[PDB]
Amino acid sequence: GAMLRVAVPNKGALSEPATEILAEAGYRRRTDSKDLTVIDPVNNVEFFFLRPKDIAIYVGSGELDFGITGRDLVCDSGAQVRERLALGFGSSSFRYAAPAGRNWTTADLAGMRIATAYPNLVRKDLATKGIEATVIRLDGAVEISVQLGVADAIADVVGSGRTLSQHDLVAFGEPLCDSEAVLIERAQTEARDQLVARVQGVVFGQQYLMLDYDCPRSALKKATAITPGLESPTIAPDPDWVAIRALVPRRDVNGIMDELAAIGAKAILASDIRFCRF
Amino acid sequence: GAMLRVAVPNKGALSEPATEILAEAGYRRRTDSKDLTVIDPVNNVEFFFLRPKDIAIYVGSGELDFGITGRDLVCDSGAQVRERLALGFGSSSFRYAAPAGRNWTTADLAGMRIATAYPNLVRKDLATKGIEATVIRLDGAVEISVQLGVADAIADVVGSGRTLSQHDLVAFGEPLCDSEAVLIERAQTEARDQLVARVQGVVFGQQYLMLDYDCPRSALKKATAITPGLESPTIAPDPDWVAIRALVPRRDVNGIMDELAAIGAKAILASDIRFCRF
Amino acid sequence: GAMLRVAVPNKGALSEPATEILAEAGYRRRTDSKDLTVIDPVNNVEFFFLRPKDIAIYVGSGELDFGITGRDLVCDSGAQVRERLALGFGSSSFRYAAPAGRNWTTADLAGMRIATAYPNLVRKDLATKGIEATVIRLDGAVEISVQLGVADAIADVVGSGRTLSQHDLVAFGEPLCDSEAVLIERAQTEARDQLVARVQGVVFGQQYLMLDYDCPRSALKKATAITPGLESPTIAPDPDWVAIRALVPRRDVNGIMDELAAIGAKAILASDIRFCRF
Amino acid sequence: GAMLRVAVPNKGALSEPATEILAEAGYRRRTDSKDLTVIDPVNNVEFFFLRPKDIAIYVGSGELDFGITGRDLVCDSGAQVRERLALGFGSSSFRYAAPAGRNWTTADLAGMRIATAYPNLVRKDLATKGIEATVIRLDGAVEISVQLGVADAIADVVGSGRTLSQHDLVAFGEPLCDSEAVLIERAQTEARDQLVARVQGVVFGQQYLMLDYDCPRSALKKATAITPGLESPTIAPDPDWVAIRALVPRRDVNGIMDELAAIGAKAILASDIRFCRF
Amino acid sequence: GAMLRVAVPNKGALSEPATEILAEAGYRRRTDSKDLTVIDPVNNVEFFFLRPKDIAIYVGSGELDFGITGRDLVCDSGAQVRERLALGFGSSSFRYAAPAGRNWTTADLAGMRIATAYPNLVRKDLATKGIEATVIRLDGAVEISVQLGVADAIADVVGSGRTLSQHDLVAFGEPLCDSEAVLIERAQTEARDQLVARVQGVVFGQQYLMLDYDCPRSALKKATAITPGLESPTIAPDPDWVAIRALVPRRDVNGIMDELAAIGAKAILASDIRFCRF
Amino acid sequence: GAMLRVAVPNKGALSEPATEILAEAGYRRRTDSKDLTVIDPVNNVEFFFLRPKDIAIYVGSGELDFGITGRDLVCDSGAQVRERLALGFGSSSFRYAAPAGRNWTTADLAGMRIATAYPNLVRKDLATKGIEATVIRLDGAVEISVQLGVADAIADVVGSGRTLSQHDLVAFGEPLCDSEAVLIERAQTEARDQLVARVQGVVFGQQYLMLDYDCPRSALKKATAITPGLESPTIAPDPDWVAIRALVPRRDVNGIMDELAAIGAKAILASDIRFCRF
Ligand SMILES: Nc1ncnc2c1ncn2[C@@H]1O[C@H](COP(=O)(O)OP(=O)(O)OP(=O)(O)O)[C@@H](O)[C@H]1O
Ligand SMILES: Nc1ncnc2c1ncn2[C@@H]1O[C@H](COP(=O)(O)OP(=O)(O)OP(=O)(O)O)[C@@H](O)[C@H]1O
Ligand SMILES: Nc1ncnc2c1ncn2[C@@H]1O[C@H](COP(=O)(O)OP(=O)(O)OP(=O)(O)O)[C@@H](O)[C@H]1O
Ligand SMILES: Nc1ncnc2c1ncn2[C@@H]1O[C@H](COP(=O)(O)OP(=O)(O)OP(=O)(O)O)[C@@H](O)[C@H]1O
Ligand SMILES: Nc1ncnc2c1ncn2[C@@H]1O[C@H](COP(=O)(O)OP(=O)(O)OP(=O)(O)O)[C@@H](O)[C@H]1O
Ligand SMILES: Nc1ncnc2c1ncn2[C@@H]1O[C@H](COP(=O)(O)OP(=O)(O)OP(=O)(O)O)[C@@H](O)[C@H]1O
Ligand SMILES: [Mg+2]
Ligand SMILES: [Mg+2]
Ligand SMILES: [Mg+2]
Ligand SMILES: [Mg+2]
Ligand SMILES: [Mg+2]
Ligand SMILES: [Mg+2]
Ligand SMILES: [Mg+2]
Ligand SMILES: [Mg+2]
Ligand SMILES: [Mg+2]
Predict the structure, then answer these.
(1) Of the residues A53, B162, C162, D62, which has the maximum number of CB atoms within 10 A of its CB?
(2) Can you tell me which residues the record assigns to a coiled coil (chains A, B, C, D, E, F)?
């Protein structure tokens, strides 16, 4: 019916992967790389390209139907939005951190100057612990704030952890947020579900591999525990053996394959896939 | 028998894709990138690398057996050649165009200075309309010929259309030619058909994806209308459902997949393929 | 005496040029590109690498002695800081802009939704005009805010103007700010002046060329009006002619050279320089 | 049990492919590209990154369990090591070569100055022929040693052969060694076999494609001679035809496909695979 | 007065150097790289970007005032144009060439199939020798025309000569044309001379270095024979020695410097320059 | 007279800078990047491109006249060669190093397993200290030899020191060798001195800048102590001031310039130079 309005990051580390997913999903790409909008007349969707912080606000306020942004940003925004899908890129860990030497606990955070780019996120986490501290807002590069003499500890996005160790800092406590890129919606229904199914179909193509193997009937129980599938594993025969098909995660596939080999599975074969409509 | 003689573009936008297709087809690649020839002794084919305009002429005159070049160039050459295969890259649209503001029709072209790099193509198109105009031959960059004051309208290769809008020009009329890279032959037969089948097998691997899904017998009719296949869809069972396999175009696969989902299809799964011999 | 504390942008379009100027000025470069600090023990200066918005704040509050950031950011910060030097890169124009078709004036801005990443800058400019409007804060990509339906006009950083024309917007009014990268100070004195003189010496090496020419005594008056120099032009003899030396701006040197040729100057010769201590 | 110790080349043409195979095999990648070691605590393996010549020695002497290096290097090392797997990259041919014009035979090598980076390899090959010559050790660039006037012929690594022809040299005799990257072991058993199976599973994914086709029962015999498979070809039905599945080498697949087409095979379809556990 | 119209190559090996010279000369650069025109309102010149062959024609016919193109193209065009300036890039040698083995002379060209992209150039050269041959027009890649069996010898652009030797061809005879990029004019005068002087000033900055040295009065005669200068060498004193200044070619400067050292010159010092107005 | 024979590294970090110096010195560059030799017929010099270790040997043994290689390699070779020139690139520090925690001295090296790629260098350094240790030869990557359990300390090439700290190692003692690229000769004279003077002229152009300033006669003494020059500073007048010219090192120029400013110098101006013949 009415044209759907979808926002994607214009720039930075969440942009290229997001525009890759949208192109794989069949959506019309931008005519020039300096465009901040594109209209796809075949699929009836208008795309806007914005800074990630603004994406959460305008899904929240209803000016956009969907957005792609970081989970941590959403956690920090306090916008009226629900996470509709996890996108499998841009992943990071949000962590308390402080100077090395002392053994640090969450309890040590009391009465401290804490620097972060995500003040609402942090204020909310401190309230759940019952801790009063003074939270200092930076725009980024927050892990030099303690060498700069503006803070005692930090709360910051961590990827590898190289930046922390290169600056003599140790992460402590459980992560406040485990972040990855997410498709958000405000907290034309068929069209909305259609878009979600397209995007999910691509994500599943990126995250899962198809496994084919022959397994003994003897071992079938253990095998389905090892490979449950995204959908019900196809199972068919052939004297006492069976042939199996199941989507499995790409991350774990060698470990999965070794376990199957360890319970008598044979002719184990992994292959890529492109899209799902499950 | 006798060694086949095949020409490919030496340089420019039709070269790399053509040499990619030939390598995927198993043919011996060039030993140094500054070579204009290579002999493949295993497959009994000699390759020459030439400017695209010359490729059409020498297939025409019999010095080459096959060539790879642009359809628009062939349309313009007037060489004795038949298009044996379409190659799915280098695509473009050949268009009349003129300055914006006026509403333009093909009839407005009468008595006008028309600039183009493809004069024979254009002379032939004007004759079919019954229009007399004066056609001006440029070597390229033809869309500045009207700001230069040498022409009133143009006939030119269009891709995105950015160049036209950046120069205040609007395309009008139906395209004179829809171009893409093509394998040509002059208008040793088993060997010739063998080469065509290799090259086609690669092209099909690039253009189609394999779709697997379960469909209700109820819906089978509509489903085969949605997925006819390059070859007859494989269909087999399983109470009232069936399992299907069909090659479908890569361009349309998300749209195709949504339609199948809309008629009760399930476990729809798209995967790449590399080669066909159909 | 005490080690000076200097901040530079960590990332983005103001970073590489700033670190280039500091290396040319003899300062110790970063040991790893993921470092946010470096200490130069020979020159007695500690460098911090931060987000540009934060640079202005911490020079303002005294935690830093000097910073390198954008003039527009400083105009927007309202921090207690004076511009000590202009750095000749990162230049831009800050502009009101609105949809094309209407003829726009500053007076049209009254009662309007204005989107900008620089709200304080804009609030201050509107107060000087006597205009009440509603200023909307975005984080960036502000020129799609009117196609998005969140604003009537914008106030934004403009470089080429391509983004504005690609989105059907026209800049109007005088620029609110003409921006370039600047060395700031809070609004150890010998050491501070030493650092400024180093940095200025590099900037002058980038912006000026040395001109040597022979000029008639006849024409000397007009010539010194054309070439005043950064310092007093060196002038010496040689019957009735003189030989001149003067630093001139790199931007204008061909125009300057033509004017000198037009008043009888000869053997006009421009050459680069690397550093000044003037 | 005990952590396995595996060495890979740190740098050069055997490094990136080796680290690609290890990442595809699920092993933990290096945290920084200037690291010479990484410990994978999930899979219980420690990786070291060394110069290729040293890899063979320390597998030989027991300080490493496995190494990845070149076969020619191993042939030259005389270390106590067995080749456990061939890795399908870094391939080369080790060749005698001498100046063009004369017709060269292995017998001509007697009494000659032979330059090579692989003296033990060459001394051993000469002993098997019964030839006494004087072998000269270079560190590399050995094909200029004859223009330099330090040798009469050479024994050297050959890839394309461009370097030889560009220096007026002709390869002669059979290759002393046909080299490619190999996984070596000293000449915790379950863990060792597990690592080999992972690495082999990746290599097979790189070297083979899956072929699906329909074949007449008439032709089945010839077809299985054309496609024997890495594993037993799957064969099932369907009036008089059969459907086949067999892994075939990627290098030969178009030739293989043509032969099958020539014996009445139909719907021949090649597709990639990622991993095997056979 | 009237705006000057100047054409530059749009693409290929003569484009970037030409646009570099124009930017160094102070002229307004293109706003987007896909533009075929730019108007410089400060300097009162309009630039067009065209294919090199067309540049010569439209200077010839008066639609352009100046063009930048290759000398060989001009030699081939037969357009009414005079070479106003040589630009010191795009240099090449136009050569007859034929298969190796025979000793070739210009006289051998009689009665032969000669392939070339420059037929008028070649027809004119043959007429001056009194030779009748049949000249065959290709669009390029002409050095495979003899392996293709369409020609006995060629006339073609030669740079390094690698392409010729890689295809078993030897250049013979004197070059028909020694080519480099040139500024052409049709065969508003002050403005035209102004543009030429700007462009020449840049070219001289690229081709010459300033030499400063002390020379004995004894040796002055030999020294001025070694360094005549673009302009009169500046000469001044200082017991029996003199100090010299002279622009010399960049290509020969080490040879020049050695000769001066060989006649007792001292403190010889070469330095770059940027622009001349001589 | 006889053609000089000069060797340069074929590959790696000493190659590009060496071939840059030779091209700037006017010598004929390689026709194809896969060539191991080039003959310069104008300057009467033949160039060979070899592995750096072999360069030292063949200068030593007289097969080459000059070579370019690393000082540390020469120190290690024990070839009959004298360092004729230092080339100002490829610089490094050769260092003992061991695991962090203990305070290390040279005396601690006694009875230890020391790993190094430079065993002769190290054996010689230990003999001068009177220390017996066991030196272990690696081909490279030597700083993992202690985590590998093959050595207690190392002697290795150090650049930044990142590799050492990333592997928990501390450098100790004075450097055994301070290395940079060097022009070597065996320990046709005019031609040899000519080549050295060319190469030195380029190196000086890379390492020094020209300084011009006005200095008080008052301060002249201190000023010439600050700027002694590569050659005698030119000094001339002008009431009580003087004007100075002196080549100074590029590395120290801002420090030098500040000191001059501190003793009343004015109009201090640094500029590049290209070549010297001093
Ligand atoms: N190592 C990392 N450092 C910082 N952000 C990361 C990292 N890894 C992933 N991210 C994610 O990137 C997202 C933010 O993207 P980006 O940095 O482009 O936005 P921004 O911070 O608003 O812009 P900018 O960094 O240009 O100021 C966050 O959701 C964050 O979790
Ligand atoms: N946007 C485009 N502009 C021009 N040609 C295009 C475009 N897209 C596809 N093509 C195709 O490229 C082919 C011509 O290739 P190419 O431009 O390399 O040859 P050419 O014009 O003879 O060479 P050159 O452009 O170097 O003078 C034509 O068949 C044309 O349709
Ligand atoms: N075309 C342009 N667009 C945006 N900013 C520009 C442009 N040209 C120059 N700049 C300058 O860049 C500076 C801001 O740099 P930068 O964009 O890296 O900081 P930021 O906006 O805080 O970070 P980010 O863009 O990653 O969110 C400003 O002073 C601005 O004037
Ligand atoms: N064209 C080639 N030239 C040289 N080596 C090759 C070639 N092709 C493959 N190789 C392989 O590369 C391996 C050696 O790798 P590499 O050259 O990185 O080691 P190295 O010779 O010890 O190091 P370096 O070359 O840096 O001195 C050998 O097994 C060799 O067969
Ligand atoms: N090695 C070379 N090969 C071909 N042309 C060269 C070479 N070196 C210089 N040139 C010059 O380049 C100019 C032609 O440029 P260019 O090849 O871009 O034009 P074109 O031949 O019309 O276009 P295209 O090659 O795209 O068909 C000629 O003046 C020619 O002398
Ligand atoms: N950080 C560094 N690490 C190693 N060598 C360096 C470094 N910096 C400079 N060099 C110099 O490089 C020279 C050796 O060059 P190179 O590494 O190319 O030769 P090689 O070790 O024989 O070859 P390869 O490293 O390919 O086995 C030595 O003189 C060394 O001092
Ligand atoms: Mg930001
Ligand atoms: Mg960020
Ligand atoms: Mg062309
Ligand atoms: Mg073209
Ligand atoms: Mg910004
Ligand atoms: Mg080596
Ligand atoms: Mg090697
Ligand atoms: Mg050309
Ligand atoms: Mg090395």
Answers:
(1) A53
(2) none
